[PDB]
Design a protein around this ligand. Structure first.
Ligand SMILES: [K+]
Ligand SMILES: [K+]
Ligand SMILES: [Zn+2]
Length: 638
């Protein structure tokens, strides 16, 4: 299977710039590229990437998305002097030309196609192209908003033509609307376009009525265009994640794309003079991470805008860190989206309810600037520790490792035994508790190991020992994810534990530190679980911000376990301990694979039970006043 991340860059794309006074254009400078690459170099990220070379897009490739007349006109700009280039520039909106920009536009496009080929040929898992000029405003017969040719539109059309793809997701998290991309695929249901963007009730450039939430596509393309307008500035991490959990991800996992292309503008980051948003560079590590289980990880990130040279380098670094699979930074201080964002989210969900099964219950009554430097991210020496039953030998990925109970550890198990399980002498259980403590010590008190999986026999003693040992070390907060019925030795009264329970018996919960999901038996179990995962489990988990995730599966319907294990590593810097009760080689293999950062198989493109949607929305109703990140409507005021 594929490994590594491509980084496609070339100094030549920094060799065009603005040559006359124009306040509308002066922010777009060559240094955006140099500062971004240099930041990757400084943090050792460029050196870990495969440096695929740039090429020129050919004429035929440019004509995938642009007209012969527009290509011919642009092809003449290398022969123009400055007066002539100014006159050519003024025929278009917010864009400038330079004798070398045609050369560079062909490289930006070629670089993007190189990234598509490297990913789709399995030569790398994923990658990023640092290109200039940007593309997403560019249109069939017009340059627009610093864009000459539409790099990301090329990539999707090229991936359709040469790899026969039926479903491509484009995610445009640049702060501007990518109207060139929307127009390109307006009637195309094979390319799903999502964009959030500063809009301010259409007063923000490019001032288009069709940038609003009601443009859902046209014809056979209805429902495959998703606009999320931001109608106030200052959007925060909580706004961006609310957008992902309640709009983008439900649609993306139902769409089930065969390739993800990110139109990655970082002018949506704090400090940018165009976006004026407040999301920290660390959020881009999670936006990347939440999309990586799609399309078996095949993700092509393409640079669009981003204009604060400092916020730019840090956001590029956070994205590449996640592409390489480094642990995600913890996001603190999350809560409800602001009211303006909730209005936008509510409105997009309602108009899209005609097209997507995640939102269909909305359609019926019965159903309805300075900021702190980001901390260092380092891949662990061994990412994943595995402890199968005694004597069982498994073939492990190159970044996993078995685990040799030390003497201090063994003294701890004895101390614990004499106090809390005086009668326990089963030397199998006592082995497992030595394994749990040893794994947790490597995960928490060392940068050596990131996560782990231990196969256990007795659930109660192992869960108690795992949870209690993590709380005292101390881990301020622990998220427990439990698939199974009954009660665990887990107290959820203080603010230190949150328990997600996936069970079979429809119970009642009254604690707002518990999320109990009773999913009805049937063929709809996968869609319902994915719906619960993105719209309930992830929002709460992210707001809780645990220091450790404790997964638990009882021995007594888990083709979703890999997706959860992968997504839930966005919490607690990836520090997850999974206890499997009893041996199941396939479940243990799947768990270790997802924990170790391996690609996860797609689910295939369907609809959940209305009883399940009702059960889930009752949970949202019961929890969202405490956990505001659950909210996907504006709250009623008194
Ligand atoms: K956008
Ligand atoms: K579309
Ligand atoms: Zn932008």
């Amino acid at each position: 299977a594929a490994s590594g991340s491509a980084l496609i860059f070339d100094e030549e794309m920094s060799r065009y710039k603005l040559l006359w006074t124009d306040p509308e254009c002066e922010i777009e400078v060559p240094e955006r590229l140099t500062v971004s690459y240099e930041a990757l170099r400084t943090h050792g990220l460029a050196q870990r990437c495969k440096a695929v070379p740039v090429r020129q897009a050919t004429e035929q490739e440019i004509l995938l998305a642009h007209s012969e007349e527009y290509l011919e006109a642009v092809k003449q700009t290398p022969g123009m002097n400055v007066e002539e280039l100014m006159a050519f520039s003024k025929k278009y909106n917010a864009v400038y030309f330079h004798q070398n920009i045609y050369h560079c536009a062909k490289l930006a496009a070629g670089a993007t196609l190189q990234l598509v080929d490297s990913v789709m040929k399995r030569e790398v898992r994923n990658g990023m192209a640092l290109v200039r000029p940007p593309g997403h405003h560019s249109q069939r017969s017009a340059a627009n908003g610093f864009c000459v040719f539409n790099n990301v539109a090329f990539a999707a059309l090229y991936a359709k033509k040469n790899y026969n793809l039926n479903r491509i997701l484009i995610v445009d998290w640049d702060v501007h609307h990518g109207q060139g991309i929307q127009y390109c695929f307006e009637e195309d249901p094979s390319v799903l376009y999502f964009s959030w963007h500063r809009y301010e009730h259409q007063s923000f450039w490019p001032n288009l009525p069709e940038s609003d939430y009601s443009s859902v596509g046209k014809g056979k393309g209805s429902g495959f265009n998703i606009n999320l307008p931001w109608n106030k500035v200052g959007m925060t991490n909580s706004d961006y994640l609310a957008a992902f959990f309640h709009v983008l991800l439900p649609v993306a996992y139902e769409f089930d794309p065969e390739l993800v292309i990110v139109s990655a503008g970082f002018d949506s980051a704090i400090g940018d003079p165009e976006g004026e948003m407040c999301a920290l560079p660390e959020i881009f590590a999670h936006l990347t991470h939440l999309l990586m289980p799609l399309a078996a990880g095949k993700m092509c990130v393409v640079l669009e805008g981003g204009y604060n040279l400092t916020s730019l380098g840090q956001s590029v670094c956070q994205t590449v860190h996640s592409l390489l699979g480094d642990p995600t930074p913890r996001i603190s201080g999350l809560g409800t989206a602001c009211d303006s964002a909730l209005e936008s989210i509510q409105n997009v969900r309602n108009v899209q309810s005609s097209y997507w099964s995640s939102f269909k219950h909305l359609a019926q009554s019965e159903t309805n600037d300075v900021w702190p430097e980001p901390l260092k991210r380092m891949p662990a020496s061994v990412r994943t520790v595995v402890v199968p039953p005694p004597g069982v030998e498994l073939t492990l990925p190159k970044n996993c490792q078995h685990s040799d109970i030390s003497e201090s550890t063994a003294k701890e198990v004895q101390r614990i035994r004499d106090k809390h399980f005086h009668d326990l002498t089963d030397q199998n259980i006592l082995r497992s508790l030595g394994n749990i403590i040893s794994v947790l010590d490597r995960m928490m008190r060392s940068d050596e190991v990131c996560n782990g999986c231990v196969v256990v026999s007795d659930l109660s003693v192992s869960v108690q020992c795992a949870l209690q040992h993590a709380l005292t070390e101390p881990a301020e907060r622990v998220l427990v994810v439990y698939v199974g019925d009954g009660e665990l030795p887990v107290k959820t009264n203080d603010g230190k534990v949150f328990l997600v329970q996936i069970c079979t018996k429809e119970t009642e919960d009254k604690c707002v530190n518990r999320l109990t999901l009773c999913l009805r038996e049937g063929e709809s179990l996968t869609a319902g679980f994915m719906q619960a995962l993105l719209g309930l489990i992830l929002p709460v988990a992210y707001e809780f911000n645990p220091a450790l995730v404790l997964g638990i599966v009882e021995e007594t319907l888990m083709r979703v376990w890999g997706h959860m294990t992968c997504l839930i590593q966005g919490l607690a810097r990836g520090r997850m301990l999974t206890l499997l009760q009893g041996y199941d080689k396939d479940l243990l293999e799947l768990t270790v694979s997802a924990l170790s950062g391996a690609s996860i198989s797609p689910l295939g493109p369907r609809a959940p039970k209305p009883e399940d949607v009702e059960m889930m929305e009752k949970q949202r109703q019961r929890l969202q006043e405490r956990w505001g990140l659950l909210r996907c409507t504006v709250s009623e005021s008194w």
